Design a protein around this ligand. Structure first.
Ligand code: ATP
Ligand code: ATP
Ligand code: MG
Ligand code: MG
Ligand code: ZN
Ligand code: ZN
Lengths: 391, 391
């Protein structure tokens, strides 16, 4: 049995799931005013971030049964039928499906659609699923009444990684020289699954020497063992890669602050945070189409690529995604504001515009990167103040 | 079962459909004087405006059966045959087809044309269809005797949005501080489908806290949830976009009032209202062709584009449609009143003429925009009076 005390660095996701817990505890409070709940919820994120652990914590916060099946184990139609029959016999319950993209061969899919339409939501039943490849799902699953809510689960930041280390060392004897805050600063790019395996390695080092406490030297030796060798499990960002990433993020923020139509900036970080930054489209944005605001949007979208070329003469895979999105926007502009030759010149002009801004404001770019390399994240209150002294 | 009491902001469309209700209740009153009814009717409008709901309200006002099929589900010929056979067995009835542009692959289309020609209109049978892409329909469907009547369904205005909110809150308990008139003023650009989803969101906020009434704070928090995030459904016009739109509409009205041949102005609004304003040609205008009236028509058609350039130095997608229509008119002028070099200079001269009027009457332009930004619409009685004090 697990609850929300076993989860670290997922504050925003836990905030959206509070409504589901209230519904499962007493459905009648929703029915008496006509509030209608969704039938399916989708969790999307990279592997090892704790999507299976979040679903089990919902069923623990409310004492309800938990029926589950894995989509990688696929007689298939008969198994789906049995799963939904059990959930109906116990009114408030949860149905969970893992690796849904594997199963959604055509007889099994049809049975699931039939089962989704054939149960009553007012009884207190809800279905959950998880995946890390949301863009290959069948469009029939996402139609209204089947799977209409989505929640994003992100990799942790420095304060999130420290919380996960504390959760998994509360039953282990530690020496007095252990500083979990220093250990967190040395593992950017780790996820919760990597951090849980690191604690086991440090305990094996102590046990093999007969000691009864884990020291600070054990933790530092375990980091090197999990990132190299014939048996490696984890990747981390090196100091050289950290510098190139910092310049890419600061290039976006500098260009936005200079163009008149640019949007406000609220956060800069080394770890990706949104669904766009994670590479998802989610099968998905202004009422009015104007020439001046579309050109300022193109210039700011190329700010990361322009800082890489003026400082390093290189190009990364993130900058290649940016150049692809820009071409799509320019193509739609030509067909609405008044062919391939025209699209190519629009993108070229915006790229030249961004490089002049980077050159003219090179001093402010350097100052921001230095702060980022030591803090790893700048938030709204501090970011707003910092941007004032510069510029 | 639904009737005309479940529909808001569609007064003009409901006025045209009253004839259809009388015909279905007693066909003999039309036959005894030789009045001949159309065989098909077409509803055209943006998605979510309630075209499917209007058809079901016609079949409820008169107690007649309602046979329907969706064109996005396309054996096809056999299904069309069955649908029309059922309708004949019950004399006064309705046949409805949704997403007709999807189905109108060639065997299905031929069967529909055969069925349209093979039923007797005097029995009390009529066919209805709906679409939001009227300009890609096959020309064979629109010939006389098949689909010869069209009705336009528009997005709602401020008073229309207030009526839809009242329809969907008549079974819900509301607090005493709720003011549906203030909520309507804060959602320009919403349609009836967006407004129905907003009421469900405000009820979920109240239920998750255990309360038994919906307060004014719930409604204001629901607006922010539906316009942003990984799960967004609606778009609204922002205060910055509102100002640019107001100047475009007032530029047309000012130029018309000054040129001697300009047409009278009856209405100005922020929401589009006609079929021309919605971007439809409808496969469709004076008996006499004169030089002076054609030049005054060109100058007034460029008044919206001229106000954008003199006040903001920008250009929108609506102004690009205007410049395209102007070129077509000038091209036809050259071939009738006495080549590409000639057309280009005619359009350039008219554009220069309109900019001088905007500069010379800048004071009256500003006064009209201020009233529009607070009322959102000026009608004939008030508009006529207002235009008198100015000028
Ligand atoms: N935030 C977290 N706090 C604590 N443990 C975590 C967290 N995230 C992941 N873990 C650990 O990750 C291990 C496995 O990850 P889990 O299966 O829960 O995630 P997942 O995203 O569903 O992964 P996968 O795609 O591999 O199935 C669990 O044992 C749990 O200990
Ligand atoms: N004027 C209105 N009054 C009340 N409800 C409305 C109105 N217009 C739309 N709706 C709501 O819109 C919802 C769906 O829209 P509907 O299918 O009737 O319109 P449509 O134009 O045919 O849409 P679509 O293109 O999506 O099929 C209905 O549940 C109805 O509640
Ligand atoms: Mg797992
Ligand atoms: Mg519909
Ligand atoms: Zn980038
Ligand atoms: Zn115009």
């Amino acid at each position: 049995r697990v609850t929300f005390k076993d989860v670290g660095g997922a504050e925003e996701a836990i905030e959206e799931l509070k409504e589901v817990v209230e519904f499962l505890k007493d459905p009648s409070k929703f029915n008496r005013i006509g509030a209608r709940m969704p039938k399916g919820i989708l969790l999307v994120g990279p592997p090892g971030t704790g999507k299976t652990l979040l679903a089990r914590a919902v069923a623990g916060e409310a004492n309800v049964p938990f029926f589950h099946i894995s989509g990688s184990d696929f007689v298939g139609a008969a198994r789906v039928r049995d799963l939904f029959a059990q959930a109906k016999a116990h009114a408030p319950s949860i149905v969970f499906i893992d690796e849904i993209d594997a199963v959604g061969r055509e007889q099994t899919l049809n049975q699931l659609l039939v089962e989704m339409d054939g149960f009553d939501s007012k009884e207190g039943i809800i279905v959950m699923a998880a995946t890390n490849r949301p863009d290959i799902l069948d469009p029939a699953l996402l139609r209204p009444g089947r799977f209409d809510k989505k929640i994003v689960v992100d990799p942790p930041d420095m304060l999130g990684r420290k919380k996960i280390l504390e959760i998994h060392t509360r039953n282990k004897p530690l020496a007095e020289d252990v500083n979990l805050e220093i250990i967190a600063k040395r593992t950017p790019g780790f996820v919760g699954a990597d951090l849980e395996n690191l604690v086991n390695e440090a305990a094996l080092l102590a046990a093999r020497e007969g000691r009864d406490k884990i020291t600070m030297k054990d933790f530092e030796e375990a980091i090197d063992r999990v990132i190299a060798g014939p048996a490696r499990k984890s990747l981390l960002i090196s100091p050289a890669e950290k510098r190139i990433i910092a310049y890419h993020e600061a290039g976006h923020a500098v260009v936005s602050t200079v163009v008149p139509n640019g949007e406000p900036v609220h956060r800069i970080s080394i770890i990706p945070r949104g669904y766009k930054a994670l590479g998802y489209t989610l099968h998905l944005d202004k009422y009015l189409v104007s020439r001046n605001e579309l050109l300022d949007k193109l210039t700011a979208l190329l700010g990361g690529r322009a800082a890489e070329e003026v400082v390093f003469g290189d190009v990364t895979s993130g900058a290649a995604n940016d150049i692809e999105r820009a071409t799509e926007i320019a193509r739609n502009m030509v067909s609405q504001l008044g062919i391939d030759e025209e699209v190519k010149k629009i993108v070229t002009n915006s790229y030249e515009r961004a490089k002049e801004i980077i050159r003219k404001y090179r001093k402010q770019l350097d100052n921001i990167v230095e702060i980022l390399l030591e803090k790893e994240t700048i938030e709204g209150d501090e970011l707003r103040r910092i941007l004032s002294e510069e510029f």
